[PDB]
Amino acid sequence: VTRIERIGAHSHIRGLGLDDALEPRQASQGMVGQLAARRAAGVVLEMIREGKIAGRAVLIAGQPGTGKTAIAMGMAQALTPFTAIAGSEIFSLEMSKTEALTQAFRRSIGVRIKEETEIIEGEVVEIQGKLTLKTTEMETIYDLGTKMIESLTKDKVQAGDVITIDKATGKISKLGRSFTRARDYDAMGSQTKFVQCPDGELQKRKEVVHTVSLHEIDVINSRTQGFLALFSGDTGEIKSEVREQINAKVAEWREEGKAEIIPGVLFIDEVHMLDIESFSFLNRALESDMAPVLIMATNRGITRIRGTSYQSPHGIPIDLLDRLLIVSTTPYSEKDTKQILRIRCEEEDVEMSEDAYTVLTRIGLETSLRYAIQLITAASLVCRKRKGTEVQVDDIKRVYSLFLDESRSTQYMKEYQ
């Protein structure tokens, strides 16, 4: 059965395969090659897990197709809030770059909140002035005040209804009657669904933990909270409501233990497209206390910084380069290429011959690796068309002749339309 998530571009890597002592293996969790980069990824992952410090950023450099995004996805899968975004996502029409980047930073941090409240739940036998609440192990009568009497009428509570009421007169009729469903043969209401009678003590205190990110500023942003939590939400995010209220409340909850923060990771793929404004903002944002661990990826060398005519390594200002730990990747070799192609074929449920693997590795060395990764499935489909059980050299050659690569494409552009 086909599901939402399926084999994709980075699904072959189940994680950052490493040993107990952070010794990268040849290839264990689908990932192969990039030993030094893998060990750096493991070190930064252990740093994230420790949560001893804040405001640490790591830059993943290397040529295109060197597995930078692969290492990032492996670390994310092995890592528990994680937020992956691109330089174009923060660019919003209704939100300035700074506001969107701050929202992403705050959403990259998790917060667990423990809630403990008294709960009374049981089947209602009859009301009135007074309630007669029944449960599997006992039954109790309760006197109803004006507020309770008003809530018993504004919500059509009646016998059999499994009601629930905590403090603050917050009554709830979670679901309808238990036994009476019989005489409701044909039609059954939309909200009037049925549930089993509760058991145990009538009044019981339940402790629940609510997991939310530090981006809850949107919840305390406007009069209505749940609405803005689905779509873009509010765009203002006044500095006051963000820092003077939410941060102080989280600090107080940490002191009294009501809440605990868990710093996540903010992976900004293709950071080279960011504007000098975003970099200048990050320069300070990485200095805050509740700052998550930042990860980046860039394929640029000595290139111009967007928004200015200046050039610097990785296409970003020097002010930030002095704040990042650069983890450069190494291009894959013949053996590493063949092994990653083997892994891709095993994950895509594609069987190929040894000569087919050799030709595919030769192609992936003469051309990009993603080209061969696609040729895998292309030749698999060609073999399926021919009804063969295994992909041979003929299939990969036919595909190589059908689908062109960047190099051959550019070479065949002599027409110039």
Binding site: K174, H210, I220
Partner: protein, 138 residues
């Protein structure tokens, strides 16, 4: 000037342009806005208190009825309703350069302009008025 409303004559099928066959609209239970009436704790409680299949409470018709009534309650989900509730000077101004004066008097003194020519609202005039649109508007 009180200008009359601009009558917008239009076809009746226009109003019936986005209506779909009643025997084609499936029950879309993908609405995650149910977090306005259900809680995570109560969600778990419902999951842990779902009636079993036997439900020992015309024979084949009644059996099919019981089956369909057991199928629907199995649907349960909630995004957040408890976490939302679990988290939480109007001085006097002159509104102008005058030293001190009641704001009501300020607003009442200076009101020269009146609207030039405001008409009533536009009213589509499809000679046939489908029951669906009229009922929705009522």
């Amino acid at each position: 000037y009180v200008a009359g409303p601009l009558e917008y004559p239009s076809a009746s099928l226009i109003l019936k342009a986005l209506e779909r066959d009643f025997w084609k609209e499936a029950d879309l239970s993908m609405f995650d806005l149910i977090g306005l009436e259900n809680k995570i704790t109560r969600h778990e409680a419902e999951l842990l208190s779902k009636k079993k299949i036997p439900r020992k409470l015309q024979a084949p018709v009644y059996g099919r009825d019981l089956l369909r009534i057991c199928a629907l309650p199995s649907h349960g989900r909630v995004q957040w309703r408890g976490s939302l509730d679990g988290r939480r000077l109007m001085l006097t101004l002159c509104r102008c350069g005058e030293s001190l004066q009641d704001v009501i008097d300020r607003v009442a003194f200076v009101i020269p302009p009146v609207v030039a020519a405001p008409p009533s609202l536009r009213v589509p005039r499809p000679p046939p008025l489908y029951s669906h649109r009229m009922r929705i508007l009522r």
